[model samples]
Target: LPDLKIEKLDEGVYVHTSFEEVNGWGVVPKHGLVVLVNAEAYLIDTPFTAKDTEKLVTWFVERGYKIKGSISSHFHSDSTGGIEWLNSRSIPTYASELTNELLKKDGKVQATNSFSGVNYWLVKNKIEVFYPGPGHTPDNVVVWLPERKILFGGCFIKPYGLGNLGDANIEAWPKSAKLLKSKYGKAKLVVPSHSEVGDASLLKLTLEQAVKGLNE
Candidate 1:
């Protein structure tokens, strides 16, 4: 694919949805995220592909993003396998606390979501992580942009449809959404990693899916 570029949505926020070429397929697609903070930037998920990651970072370097931090929706391969790449830069990522503990045990940024199909083997990015709590996964994270009221949800949300039930947390998912809602209740825009942008209802829809697993 050609070089990757950032889409500027807000004054300082840019959308990064680049992916890698896997087995000739464009997998992961740009890891999806925002760059350029107040002179800093963030590289979101590792996406599901490997090639896209390199292209994305290079794009940032070319554009002059002083990457202050990088994050993921969880620790899934396509979500976080680029650890070594980001770690080389010495930038810390955010994830759930439990996920962090699990990382220590796995010895390779290897932490399972325990969210059904989520496994550590699938990850491809490496960076500091924070576990908000158990929801989408014990290691899942809901990224928020307080200044713009734009919530960056990695697999945690999508605007076009209900949440994915395949690897979703049935029991803990609601609380996880509640946590996001509480954190971004004041948000005017919600950007789900997989879907288009939406409003507060997107959160409600996701919570409903967590409880019912039915799409509306």
Candidate 2:
């Protein structure tokens, strides 16, 4: 199937999305990322289902890279949807403690590693994870690659010009977007989960949209 599409955004960073669409507020295509550094790969998120997840992992293995681990940006399946697949592969998955708790309450498997507000990965490249506050969900997180100035906003930040909040933390979204702007304002590449990638200024527009959404 024409399911997974991967694109390189920087020297060591890549973004991928699945053609398979799932519905919540509406049909939303799944998106994720892969980071390669020093021959080791780290997955930031996963596709909507385990079958597609296996395809992604196979894609990596066939390319001669070993997956070091993976991170879930939030509790949503679009973010950590491939946990079971990853576990089957013996790959450790990382997520916020809150995310683990929520998933557990739902009788789901949890990530292997846990952290609080922020977590940083040091391989050949540096990946920073932060909980800006709350936007798409209480546990949604964003990953930043300082060397590449790439901010992987996951699903917390909206796609370019998308006004529908879609199960997001509407009241707190503005704050999350604002903090994301301040903390990662220097980012040259901002990748949203479901649409076109943009730069730092997109955060401001997201903030404005969230604010306006709250007003109306």
Candidate 3:
């Protein structure tokens, strides 16, 4: 089994890191977020596999938080891989309509719920999910916690590196990143899906990288 690590980011917010071995990438770490609202907990994304998801779920259940639901950032396995395990426990899952469509086209498990554009309240007034446009993937979306000023960029914003362009829309990525920044550039904390978390500068850096990729 791969290692799983959970770190507290704020009073009731956390970042979970899980590992998976990729053919060209060796052991890669995928990051997700967890938000606790009283006795309830919501997952931003699942680990790379069901086994790791089980470990993540066990950690929460052991801590007395009910696993309320989960939201996938995109259709990639890194984002949606553990939906099957979540389904086994009857946990509700969410994703963008485009994400669900891509997952269905790829013959992957789809989230139980799907939405379009912005979802103002995945956690009532605490969390919001937004689709800026196509970036890392056509269906990629970011999670924003307005109260905490935390922006969970998922795979949409990279901490570094060129990232996986297998399904990226290079031409549209920069504009999408710009749109995201215009809305949440003041975010105090910005968390990316693949590496170290930083402030909103991560979003700026990602926009720069997207532009660089387009030019070259």
Candidate 4:
């Protein structure tokens, strides 16, 4: 990824989209986004490696977005490792109650393999986190990119098949999926924080597959 660098897509939207050459293994070069809302940026999903998270934070700080909050679509390290860096900078993270709890219980179940190497504290939501329900995890929460008409579906909206269900809730996932559609009222772009940005079709596919996989 010589020429590969983070890009700014819009005023309050940036694509922390990194890929293969940089990340190794079955890691699947996860891509995430950040929103510059009210001078504060909300990092949608963060990658596991410290360097990866650092790149993202550097991307925002260089572009002048006030680093304020970090939110993970679920209780995964790839989406939360940035907390180690974020909190060090005194940036508070916002997560659903369940997500915070899940992170506390056992962070490794969410694809983290450091076995207690991570020593990071999470920021409890000073505000209300509207937990739509179980998405990819029992604690997954769809972050609201209210300013851009975009709802960061986290791991739910996989415009591509990259949305992993190995840790997903196939049954209860639908209700929350439906709620996301109803409340968000469809957006210009539906980002699942993983695949390429597209319509809500990915979310629909996730729900459909989850239900089918669970034989529900």
Candidate 5:
């Protein structure tokens, strides 16, 4: 958290990616989102460690936002790394059943609640947890904020281009991306797990890249 940087995108939405220098695959960077509404904050992902999670939680508290709960976009350490830490604070964790199952298999901290299909967190605004299909991982999902027209496509959709599938389901990648594009094509802002935040074209580019990766 010492190197954590939070960037405000909208009035109540913010994003920060914590660099995981000692990650399994490599020195991976994981992006997280803090969605605030009516004095409450919902975390879409977390830093790569419990210690950093605690730091992130404290950072929000210090800013006068009450913790609502936390949800992972997938089962990867980058997405659910703070599960134990959030649970320690009695913050409920949510994810797809597939994700929870994978977390259990990986011996990672498990989510408190699990759901399939679309899950909506409604308050002053709404946050949508959507599972179109598979991409970066079998359990991967994306977070959508309808009010803001923002799609946070964790690692399921890449920020830049392709080449690094990262345990992706190559055959199903473009299929899932097609679903995403059809459903959230109107998203004005698209934020991926890493790199620059762009518009809906980013999703199209990802789908195109996936197709290219598939035939290779």
Candidate 6:
């Protein structure tokens, strides 16, 4: 709990950042989104571990909010690590079908629900999940709150540098980022998985980095 920090971004939107000490990465921070829909709470991605995920859920529960569901942006630990814990609580969890396949191959817990293509709505006209293409991972997706014009870029959109390319589709990243920019170019707030959260400029910054990475 001490390693987790939740910051309110808007009236009903909060960003939950959790820290994990990776062997080579040292203390790494993973970001996730908590969206309040009426009395229900929806999560986009989870913390770096189940313990922190529990703390995140408890934080909402303490405030009299019901855990509605959770959706992972990709197959990586930062995206689906808390899935097992969420499943244990019988809270609905979702991810792209491809993400689940990748998770299976990686021997990680898979999300309970799976969707395909570019669009899936967690909350009608409120929270929308779209898979522009591959960047950070082949199955990566971004969450969009249309009414609020808030884009939760997950690991697909970096705040600054290209953090991890181990599982990245380098050649396709730029294209994916382009589609994202064209789709949500007007996003008022762009929240990346790590680093500082900023405005729509983050999308352009990520696009720039994706192009640079592809060129190199």
The candidate that achieves the highest lDDT relative to the unseen native structure = 6
TM-score of 5: 0.92
lDDT of 6: 0.90
Give the alpha-carbon lDDT of every model: 0.58, 0.79, 0.89, 0.60, 0.83, 0.90
Give the lDDT of residue 109 in candidate 2: 83
State the lDDT of candidate 4 residue by residue for 7-126, as single tens digits: 666566776765443233343456677766566776767766567777778777887777777666667775776666666667666555555667778643232221111112222232
What's the TM-score of each model vs. the native? Answer: 0.72, 0.90, 0.96, 0.76, 0.92, 0.96
Between the candidate structures 1 and 4, which one is better when assessed by TM-score? 4
lDDT of 6 at 107: 90
Comparing candidate 2 with candidate 3, which one achieves the higher TM-score? 3
Per-candidate Cα RMSD to the true structure, in Å, reads 7.1, 2.3, 1.2, 6.5, 2.3, 1.3
What tens digits encode model 3's per-residue C-alpha lDDT throughout 1-216?
367999999888999998877789898888999988889899999988898889888899999999999999999998998998998899999988999999999999889988896554687678899889998999999999878899999999874755879999999999999999889999999988888889989988999999999898
Model 6 misplaced stretches (Cα beyond 4 Å): 23-25
| Candidate 3 residue runs with Cα over 4 Å from true position | none
* Candidate 2 per-residue lDDT over residues 1-216, each given as its tens digit: 356778887897778887653445355566678998778889988887788888888888899889888889888777877888898879988888888987898688898888885555534358888788877777888888878888888877774543445657788888888888898889898888877788987788777877877677
Error of 6 at 115 (Å): 0.5
Q: Report the C-alpha displacement of residue 17, candidate 4, in angstroms.
A: 2.3
Model 5 agreement with the true structure over 1-216: per-residue lDDT tens digits: 247768799878999778865445565667788998778898988878887788788889998988888889888788898999899889878888999999999988798988886555533248888887888898888999988999998887773565356667989999999999999999999888866788998889889888888888
lDDT by residue for model 6 (127-147), tens: 999999989999999999987
Model 3 pairs in collision: none
Give candidate 3's error at residue 39 in angstroms: 0.8
Clashes of each: 32, 0, 0, 1, 0, 0
Worst 10 residues of 4 by lDDT: 111-120
Task: Flag clash pairs in model 5.
Answer: none
